[model samples]
Target: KTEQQIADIVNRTITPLMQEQAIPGMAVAVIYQGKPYYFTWGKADIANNHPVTQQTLFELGSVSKTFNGVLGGDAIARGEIKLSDPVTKYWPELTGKQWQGIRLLHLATYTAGGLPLQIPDDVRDKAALLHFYQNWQPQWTPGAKRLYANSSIGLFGALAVKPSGMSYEEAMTRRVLQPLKLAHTWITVPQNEQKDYAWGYREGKPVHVSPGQLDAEAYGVKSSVIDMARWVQANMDASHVQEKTLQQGIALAQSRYWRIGDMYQGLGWEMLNWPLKADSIINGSDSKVALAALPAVEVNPPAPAVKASWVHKTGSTGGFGSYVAFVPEKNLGIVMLANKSYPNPVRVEAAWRILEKLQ
Candidate 1:
C-alpha cells in the first residue's frame, strides 16, 4: 500500500533523529496527492508509558506565526486591512515618530529592522508590550534588514485582529482554523482535548506553554499531526477551502512578498528555490539570521505563489519542536511534531531527506 511506502520513507528518515535527541515522542504526517499518512513513535508521557498517536497534541511554537500570516492575508483579501498601512493606524498610542514608516507588510515578513528574536521577560502585560514597541529603536530601516522575531509577527496579528473586532484566538479560529476544519487546532487547548495533549519534556521535566502578552499570537498553538496535515493540505490546494475569500487569502499568504537573497518570504511560510538541500535550508533557518539584521528587499504588489518552490516553517517551545514543509509542484507535504525541543538544523535535515526519498 502507498501508506506503507510512506511509513517506510518517514521511519527510515525520522527514527535516527529521534534517537539522536533521545526525544520522548513524535507524530508525523506525510501528505501526497492531498492525502495524509499518519505515523507516531515513542511515548507521549514517559512516566505513564503512553504512546504517541495521531491524536497526540503538541505545541506548535512559532509555527503559530504562519497562522498570523494567513490571518493578515485574509484581512487584506477582505479589504479589512492593507499591507501599506502604518502600524500606528492600529495602535495610535505609538506616538513616537519611529513607527511612522513601519508597514503591515514589514511586520508580516520579519523585515522590521532589528526586532528582538524573543520577547523580553519584563513584557508580561499589554501595557509593557505597548511600551516596549513604543520605546524600540530600529537598527536598520524597515524592509532594509531582515531580523526574524516574534515581535513583528506577534504585533502584526494583534493589529490584524483589531479590524475583525475579535480576540486573536477567535479571529484566527473563524478565519483560518475553523474554515480549514482543523478542529483540534487551538491557541487555548480545551478540556476535552487535554487528554490527547502530549506532555512536553525539557531538562527531563514536563512543561507546557505559559502564555504572556502576544505569546498566543506568537508561539502558542496546540494541534495534532492529523489536524496539522489537514491545514497543510489546505495550503497545498486552495480548493480544499470551501470559503472563497479565505481560499484567496491562503493563496495570497503563500505568495512570495519579499526576498532576502535566495530565500523568499510569504505570509507565514518561507520559500527557497526548489530541489532544495538541507545545507541551504539549515543556513536559512539558522538562529543567527533571527538574531542579526540582514537586508531584505520588498516586493510591492507581492507575486503569486509559484511552482518549483519549497515552502516551510519551524516551531519550538521550551519542550516541543515542530516543522512543516511542502512542495507544491509535487503535491506533497510533511509535518513533524515532537514532545521535546531539538535543533532546527536536524529538523530540516530529517524533513529534506524524507522529501528526497518521497520524490
Candidate 2:
C-alpha cells in the first residue's frame, strides 16, 4: 500500500521518456489491486513553473471516442437505436446504394468501409459535409474492413444526437460525465477551468488541438488524470456505477463486436489477450495498422467481455498524447498522459512496463 513503491516504478519508467522527448509535463495514475496511486512529472507550464498535478487537464483526443461508444451503446440499451438499421435511418438524405452498405453500429466500431482517417478538408461545414457524403463511396465494403477514422466515429457520436435529444457534448456531459462525477472532463473547458489545463507542446512550442469538423464528437475531450483514472476503473467493472444506463453502456462498449487476428474491436476501445506481448500492443496502436483498411470478421452474436482481457484505447492531439489500459482479472489499469504528442508505442511501452513491474 506504500505509494512510494508505485511512484518509484513510474519514475524509473517515465524519466527517460520525458528527457528524450523534451515533454513539459505528464500525469500517471495506476489502479493496482483495486487501489489507485498517482504520480506526476515535469511542468504543466514551464514559464510559470507549474508542475503537473492530478488536476492538470490534458487533451484526450480519440480516447474521447470511448465515451461516444458508451453513449451509443447506451442508446441501444435503451431501445432508442438499433445496430441493424442503415445509417440512412438517422439521416434519410444519406440513402443511396453506397450509404446503404453502412449501419448504425458499423460507424462506432470502425468497420464502416474504408473511411479516411480524417474528414476531407473540402468538407469544412454542414453544407460541405452533406455534399461530401452524397458523393463519397466506400473503398472497402462496410464491415469487411476496419479503417479507424474520426470521420466514422464522429458520425457515430451524432447517431446518439437524436436519441440524446441534445448536442453530443451536452448529452455526454449530462448523462455520462455528470453521473460519473467527472467534474474535470470537458469538450469545452470553460474560462475558469482554463487555469488548470495543460499546454500541449509541439517542437518545444506550446500548442493544442484546433477543432475540426465534428471535433467535439471525435476527439475533443480534455481531462485530468484523476477523472481519467475513474473512467478506467469504471470500464473495468461498471456494476457498481450509480447510473444504470451508464453502467450498462460501459459494458456494451467493452463487448467484442468484431475481430481481426488477436485485435478485438469494441465501440471505441481495442482488446487484446491479457499478458499479451509488446508487439501486439505496438501493432494495434501502430499508425500503419490503424490507418490501413484491414479485414475484420464480425462477431455474429456480440460476445460478453472476458475477465482476463486487456482492454485499451490511445489518444493523441497536436500537443498531447494519452493512453489507458486495464486487465480486469488483475484489477490493473493505468493512465499515461503527456503534454507533448510523443509516439504511441512509447506511451504503450511505458504503461506496459510500469504495470509489469508492479506485478
Candidate 3:
C-alpha cells in the first residue's frame, strides 16, 4: 500500500479512538525494506501548534530496552562483554550480591527475576542503581522464571553505561545511535529541538508525565519514528554484525528462551500473537492461572486475539506512549507514538488491525 493510503487508513481508524480517549497528538511511521514508506501525523505540541514532524522526539519508556538489548549484543560483539557474565564482573562491588546470580543476558530479556517493577525508592541515584544491583532481594529464583520488570531492564541499561565512564546518552551515542547514524535519537532532547519536542498533554492542556527527571536507563531516551525505523532496519539486516554475532543477536532477540505463556519475550520485545484478542495478554490476561503466573501484574483480559504476522513492544512513561514492531517475513514495520498514556491494548489492536489489512 502507498504511504498516503496507509496514513489515511490509520488516521481514519485511530484518530477517532485517540479523540475519544483524549490523546492530544500522535505520529505514525511505516517502513518496508529499510525505506520509510509512511510519515504522517498530528501536532507534536497541542498548545503552541508545533507540528509533529518525522524528527519530533518523545520518551520511549521501556522500549528503551531495545537499546539495552543492542548494547548487550554489541558489547559481546566487541568482546568487551559476555551475555552470561555476572553483572558483578563489571561492577566488582556487586560481587556476592543478591543480583550476583543475575547475568547480563537475564536483564536483556527482562528475566532479571529479582528487581521490582520500578526502582525501589531507596535506589534512585547512581549509587542507588548500583546498590540495588548489589542488594536487590530476589522475589523468584534467577532464570528459574520470567517476570516483566522495567527496573531490571533499565538497570541493565544503566550498568551497560558502567562506572560513570560516560553519560547514558554518550554511551548510546557512541555505541548504537552514532553507529547507525540516527541523528534524532538521544538520552535527552537537545535544547534546539525543544520547539520540535512534543510536550504531552492531559485533558487538553500542555503537560508532561515526568515533571522533573533524568534517568535514561529507566525512561529518559527519546527518538522519532524516522530514527526508530532505522533501528528496525538494523535489526532486520542480516549483515549488521559479524555472521556469528548477528546470529547470536537474532537468537537473543527472537528466542522463546523464556516463556511467559504461549507468548514469548525476546531481549526487549515480546513475540505477540498476530491478531489480538481481548483475552490475549495485551488486553490483560485470559486465564486466572496465567494471571497467577505473572507475579508482576494482575488482571484477566477480555478482548479477542487477532492473528497477524507480527511481534511487538509497547511502552509508556509519565507522558508518552509508544509501540514499535515489525513482521520479519513481510519486511514491514509500524511505529506509533502518542503524547498521552492511552492503554496499550487499544493502541496495539488498532495498529495490528492496520497491519493486518495492509497485507
Prediction 3 TM-score vs. true: 0.83
Lowest summed lDDT window (length 10), candidate 1: 284-293
Per-model TM values vs. the true structure: 0.97, 0.97, 0.83
- Worst lDDT run of 10 residues, candidate 3, spans 296-305
Task: List clashing residue pairs in candidate 1.
Answer: none
Q: lDDT tens string, model 3, 1-359?
A: 76677777777877787778777677777765456654546778765778778778877876777776666555565566665778776667776656667787677656666556666655556766666666667777667556666676776766666643776668778767776777988776768977767887665666654522235665667888788877776665545544465445543555444555556656565665554453464454222332233532211221121224356777777678888877766667788888887877777677667766666
Worst 10 residues of 2 by lDDT: 283-292
**TM-score, ranked from best to worst:** 2, 1, 3
Off by over 4 Å in 1: none
lDDT of 2 by residue, 60-157 (tens): 98899988888887788777887878888887898678998689878888888877789886678889987877777888888998889998889888
Provide the lDDT at 266 for model 1: 91
CA lDDT of 313 in candidate 1?
93
Q: After superposition, how far is residue 17 of candidate 1 from its true place, in Å?
A: 1.5
Which residue ranges in model 2 land beyond 4 Å of their true spot? none
